[model samples]
Target chain A: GFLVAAIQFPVPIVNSRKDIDHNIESIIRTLHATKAGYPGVELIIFPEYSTQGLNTAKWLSEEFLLDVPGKETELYAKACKEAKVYGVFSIMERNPDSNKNPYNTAIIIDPQGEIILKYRKLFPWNPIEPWYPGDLGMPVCEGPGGSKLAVCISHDGMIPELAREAAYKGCNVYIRISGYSQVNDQWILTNRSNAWHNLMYTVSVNLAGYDNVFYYFGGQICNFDGTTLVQGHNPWEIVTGEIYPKMADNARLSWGLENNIYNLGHRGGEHDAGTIKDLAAGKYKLPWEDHMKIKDGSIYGYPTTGGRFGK
Target chain B: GFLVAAIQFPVPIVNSRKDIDHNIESIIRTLHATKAGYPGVELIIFPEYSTQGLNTAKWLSEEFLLDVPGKETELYAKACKEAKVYGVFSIMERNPDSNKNPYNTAIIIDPQGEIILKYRKLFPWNPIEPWYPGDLGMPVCEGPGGSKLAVCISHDGMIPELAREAAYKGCNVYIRISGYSTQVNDQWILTNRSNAWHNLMYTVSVNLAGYDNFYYFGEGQICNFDGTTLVQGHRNPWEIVTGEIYPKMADNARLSWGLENNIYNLGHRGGEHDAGLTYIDLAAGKYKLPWEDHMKIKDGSIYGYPTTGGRFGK
Candidate 1:
């Protein structure tokens, strides 16, 4: 079992390097304060672009993007070690290979202040987001209380297969960090479904309060049973939950009937006198795969508009 | 858009062939009354095994297990033709060619009283359920006002793949019929909402109520495209939950939405990249986790329960 904390801080638009440093100072202080305030806090989570904010230039510019193991990451690394808590933070990653399109990255820092899991956003909030399409597939690592953890960013949670892949890889807790204030209803809907469908805890946080244009809703924690453990919209109001991923692992073993993750594997295995070979074989595929109209995501030709006006 | 009704009637354990016939008559009578009672009632659905109950049979008989187009289905067809309302009904279909395993079947009858769709529950609630694994894959048929429809039984909805199959086939309204008690109440609601949300379609589901040695839970519901409960029933029997759902709105959203258009995005996963390797592994029967080979209940041998045949007197 582990105690988790989600920071619903008011995100401000960044203008210069000084603003980024100020945000980091506040984040470090909050990490130290929250670990002390909420005793036994094993993990702390922040929303997407925690350091860069929603300022378009701060987001789009290569100057503001931080490298994975760079000096900027060490600022939080030191804070995580001092606080003695596993920390998950998001930042605009400077991809030297694809310099034109930087990556939106989520990194999990252990108590030893080492990067344990790092994932790039697979499905960017396209046409609006000018970031590299994620290539480092969703990775799950051993987390607190012997649980497996995986993280994906904002729009990545919208697709069902993202979470299903994590479940298939045996993730017990899926962390979804976002900077969303609009489509809040869809946010809650997808998060709730992801938790119940996979029998994993959805520990999520969203950028909150007014950021010049939008208001990110709040942070949410949903248990394996599809019940919201906690959520509040008030900015800077940190939401906390006592999570036990072990119990979720146990539920997977115990449940026989509604255990979908297991059931999908053994489709019609009992039929044909237990020979168990009905699974799609030689050239067998789903009928609908070939029938899909927009196979390349060109719906109404909207995606070709490209990211944010200027290149 | 059309008005839909779900019958949450008290389902009883069958004692003889007459009881099964009586259920058909009572169900037909309600269909007649509800059409007159609630105007513009286009589709009315019944719970799983509406004709045969949670009862076990002694001999291979149509009296206990029904045939798809046989005498039992004729009763529903005659009523739907007269009432001028499309009806969805359930029964135990005896697989006559092999003639051993009976399938839990659902049939959709149009206002013309013709069987338009037939679907068998693919995932049998094993160890306790005595039925054949469905062979007639999930079917989607054209329904009221240019809507396409599909149906799956109780435990079948637990697996997301079943609903995904229906949605992939362009089903506008996914109807799930169930006859579960208290144990399944929670799983029912969340799965129903997820199905609608994931598919961007409407879900109309009903569970049978009253005692069959144990209480059959009731909470018939109708949900919109975004997973909002349009209307829901109490946890008791005889409550006909009614609501107006626009299948066109659901159909339109699939084509129009820009963001979080989940179903479309799933196929185009990384926009242009190949879908996650999980599906390919699934197709080849190679979906394995590190801890998966230790599955205790996979074949139900851990509990000493048989996966095939009846529970009472087989």
Candidate 2:
């Protein structure tokens, strides 16, 4: 059994590096409190934009961006080492590869203060989000107590594919950090369906307070079977739940009929492939291929409008 | 707006041709009753296996399988024409093309006794079912009052793909017919809600009333695009539920800013930036994730290092 903590706290808007580090210290204190309260909690997850908060392009700069193992993550790592637990925290990461743009990135710090997993937010909420699209794909890493963990950021959890891909990669525990003011119903529906479809234990945490425009509504956790374990009633509250990885492992190995992820392979013996492969290979036909020829202004094609800010 | 009905009634288990015709007559009387009660109802739908009621292999025979436009469909068409209302009815259709196997099919009959849509169950509940898999893909046809309608059998509705395909095919009204017993609660509710919310379409579903081995709980339902139930029936009894197809809602969903991402066309919506397209690309092996290299399947298990009896670490 793995004990997990969904850290729901008020995300403070930062104007400088001092405010960002202040929020980091606040999170470290919360993580310490979580370890003290829950005792055997192996993982503690913070919400998306946990440090810098969601700011517009005018506020975005090198001051707001951070390096993965830079000063900010070192604070989180030091906290993990002191607490003897893994912590997942998010920040805007400055691109080390190029001077292009920053990424809305999340990282996992082990008990030894070593950065094990780092993933960029793939599907950033379009039009409003100024960060560049994630080039780093979904990454799963070993966590405290041998838990296989995967991470996806805010809008990434909206689609079912992110969780399924994590499950397909053999990650049984999915951690999603998000901040949404409205659309609570969509969040609940997608979170439930994501856990159920992937058959993976999911812990989703959103920023709690109002960030001028949106209201982030705390957190929720679900078992592998889609049963919600706990939901944070108040905004700034820590909720803990125990999830068994072996139970999920056994379900994947056993349940034959509805284990859609495993049985996705075609039954054509030697030349078998999943439905997605078949679709990409042009062997399968989408029902709208004939009737609805998505013309020039149709939503079916690539978007020409809503380019990134200052692009 | 189109008025639709989910015709939920007891399915008569049949062993002979006599029972089959008797069931047909019973359905006709119910149709007449529905017309008298809910006037101006444009479409009426019955449950799956409504004609032959899930019989064992001992009772399965070509003699019981009816043709689409044969004596059975003609009976439904004649009733529909007389009642001046369209109907969606299900039966075991004998394959005239090949002698391979019959199909579990549902057909839509216009008020003028015309066959509009015939969709064989694409994904039949396999192994136990003897009916052939549907070769004819999902087809949407014009219905009473210029409504676009599509039909899916019981098990086909379990997968989101079938319903999404129908929605993508410009179908505004989706009719699903099933005869599930108690398994109807989770599967029926979630699938219908997901389909309606994701595709923005109206759903009208009907389940059988009663049977021996399985209690076919009669839960006839009609839900709007937002999954608000327009009507629902009492359990284990014959009932009818009506719903309106709102063209304005569908049009608004198509055009509105935040309302439009239907998840059907997610690939082209934003390309790599879109999670749906990124996933499809990944599933098609476009690029591999970092941890995928550590992934290995040994002895039929996909995970690596952690064997059946072994642990990765203590």
Candidate 3:
């Protein structure tokens, strides 16, 4: 069983920046307590912008922003190591590059307390205006787990490519860390729900709660087939759920040309020229595969080749 | 040739709600002057949220939003009257019913100052979160001079489904009002330059000009398939450009199977829903023929088309 937990938040912290360090400690303690209680929990996920809270100013500034190796991350990394459980958290990170701007980032820490994957939101808060900076890196390893693993930030899961990126890269389990408000509940309940269902072998842990600017949020988890396993408080806080990976070894049931036709790399949608494509072409070696388009992604029959219908 | 003006905007606005009515009028005057300065300019389009300035709050307020027949719409109906030209503008509308929320709305007023079509932004903006609301109704109006017209607000174009909905619905020309901006000039340049070359219509005009807090805006104009300009401008101030669109000659030649209408005549493999990215060819280095590269074939090792039991298989 791939046991997991999704921590539903109370409204994101709206307190002053000075309170961030304290809030971080408070949240970490809560996370640790939750992990300790759930002995079988292999991974724990949090909501987006969990570090700075929802206030835009706090989110964009140093008060809520922290470096990857900063004290807060170190604290969590240590917890991950000690607990021997995977964990996911979102933070507003300041880009040290004088040229590069800050971003809403999510990091995955392995059971060993070693940093696993760091994903920056590709689609920022305001898509049309381009108010926030996006991540430049590709998906990476979380650790040497019993099963391969990866994680996605909030909006990264909205776009088809992120899942394709994670899946094509050989990740057996993908976790989504996010905080969606009432304004976008339909996404968590609909598009996002369906996306996870369409893409095989991926699960998402969404945060639940609201902030001053945002009126509502929820903590929800979806199995790779997009089924909602655990949902957060409707108007309260603290939701925990577990996920079990399909027992079959054919995790690639969705990987065939017939079923998994919509690989963004094959379609040449938004060319990032990253490792996933090289992995698909070089490591996996699918000939003429790169020539495919998104149009070819129209899968016909049952999603996973598990349990035949009228055999 | 069918002629219409396409308009895009600098960025989201921080303008005060008090001056909204006046702001819209001044914009109308500017576009009219641009058309009069150039003869044969029949129609013009302003960016989405041209009225409320992509004002999410104002858009959220129900009392402030108005239907096409309501008092707020008559103002633009009046503007179209004065300009003596058909105009398309994006407006955040309020429904009187408290049950339904306001929508990212657009209106197409005819040359005679009559409201023709009201198309809402089908794909609402939900970056990290969904902000604006979507509309359930989208009506296309048949206009004089072979113009099958439709309107959509910002981010509506980003979705393949909505774009196809308009195209397949027989919209000869689709008017999009948007407030698109970028702090990174390089990214904007890449997207703008590439999008201009790969546009799907006969003519597209994006609003280009600078508004306070929108420094990245500049260069609004109409682009035709032959890489000719219908109207063009810098991102300095309000401006307009008009252009012509002769009906798409080989639109039929570009047809492939799988669409609901199946108009172009083709076989179907079934289970393929209408998700429009099938035709998205960004580099132009690759072939975009619907049938050629997109066709699902079966050979071996899963991960593409032709399922295990596809098409009477053994």
Candidate 4:
């Protein structure tokens, strides 16, 4: 059992490094205030692009990209240590190893002030927005009070696959941080289906205010049973709720065939279908398993060749 | 675009084959009345096991089993000819080749008084249900106004895979017929709406109104692509709901997804089962395939409270 909060605020487009510091400071203050307001609150999730906002491509260059556990996360770590709470934050990360592009990443800061999980956005919305595809596979981290937590950045939650992956790894509490305001309808629908189908608690927060070219309408925090516990009707509001991991665990085990996460992953079907064990045993093969048709995933680059949709 | 109706009515448990015919005739009367009242309703759907109400384990013998395109289907075909409308009906079926148990099946009859499609319920509610599992996969049939139609029985709609299979096969209208009452809270809107929205198909769902010893809730309805109810009937009593569905509109929405970032064919990734990432491919990938990795739940595991073979399972 735990109390979680999703901070929905109008993220200002930071123009300089000092502006980034100010954004971090404001978020830290909000966290401190939330801790003071709701005593024993264990986890707090911030929206995607919480610091940089959306349109970073116009104002900033690649040099402005921060590392996963860089100074920004350090500040968050210090804030979490001070508040004695766990936190999940999203950011654009600069990979020092390669110079191709930065990753849209989410970091999990444990209450002990250590970065436990770093997940890159797997499926970034394309054609409309330009963000590099995530390379770091999904990772689940242990949080306070034996809570198994997984984080997906923004558009990742739109697809049920990421949420199911988290649930597949035994994460009962899933967090999605987003900056998408145009597709609020999809957001609402996906949130309910994701939580309901996966039988896990989901906390999703979107930018509450305008981000240069977009207006982020935020209002969503779903519990384990797919009920929205609280919502942010406006910008800069902290929606809070409580969730029981044991409840999700029990449902996963007892919900019979409707326990979709278990049934689909374990028992394939009532007839000739083989289970996930068959796939692992090489007894079964997927169409795209060996050779994918469309291989290019660059956000800005046009498809030169490949699958059916390839240009 | 075409008009469709789902006939919901209280089902009488038949003690004999003659009782089965009476029930079928009653349903045919409802179809005739619906077509007469809401003329030009191209298709009508009836509940699963509409001829024999559920919990007829004692009254029904293997000899009572009907075959697809046999006398039972001919009865529905003749009724369709009389009503001048297409119809979908369910019945218990016997297989001559295989000595297995009879199957829970749904048959579609076109306006020409011909059997168009015959679908077996892929997934029967287990432990409580004794019907044989379906061998025939999900099948899509051609309908009036160039509409592609697919059928799923009560329990079959619970699995998203079956509906996805129909959609992947280019079906635009999906019909689900069920006898489930107690689980209506979850079964009614969730399966219908989820399948409709995800697959971009119009849905017409009908449930048995009521039965002896079991008060079945009748809530036959039709929903558009966005899950907006076009028409619905109340619980119990013989009732019919009519709604217009444009298959072209569904096709347009589906085409939009295909034009942009389509989640089905193009934009899927591998998940926990390491199936292809695209939801469509993952569904197709896991088609008829089981999994090695599954949630490990032991009997009497420290979870929900113990039960004595509840309504759903033993």
Q: Count the backbone clashes (under 3 Å) in each candidate.
A: 0, 1, 30, 18
- What is the CAPRI rating of model 2's predicted complex? incorrect
With candidate 4 superimposed using the best TM-score fit, by how many Å does residue A172's alpha carbon deviate from the native? 2.2
Q: Measured against the native two-chain assembly using Cα atoms, what DockQ does each of the candidate structures obtain, in the order listed?
A: 0.32, 0.17, 0.01, 0.22
Docking class of 1: acceptable
Model 2 lDDT, full chain set: 0.69
Ranking by lDDT: 1, 2, 4, 3
Estimated TM-score for each candidate = 0.89, 0.82, 0.44, 0.82
Give lDDT tens digits, candidate 3, residues B248-304.
Answer: 431321232111111111111121122112222222323122222333321222222
Ranking by TM-score: 1, 4, 2, 3
Isolated chain A TM-score, each model? 0.85, 0.85, 0.71, 0.83
Q: Estimate every model's Cα lDDT from 0 to 1.
A: 0.76, 0.69, 0.49, 0.68
**lDDT of model 4 at position A160:** 58
lDDT of 2 by residue, A89-204 (tens): 98888777554557789999999999899898776564455566676677889865556899988777755656767876778888888876545665666566667766678888
Candidate 2 has what TM-score? Answer: 0.82
For model 2, the DockQ equals 0.17
Per DockQ, the best of the predicted structures is 1
Off by over 4 Å in 1: A213-216, A268-311, B56-63, B96-100, B211-216, B277-280, B300-314
Question: Residues A230-283, candidate 1, lDDT per residue (tens digit)?
Answer: 876666778898889988887787776656676665553532211112222323
Model 2 misplaced stretches (Cα beyond 4 Å): A57-59, A95-101, A143-147, A211-218, A262-311, B95-101, B144-147, B213-216, B228-230, B259-265, B268-270, B273-314
Model 3 RMSD in angstroms: 22.2
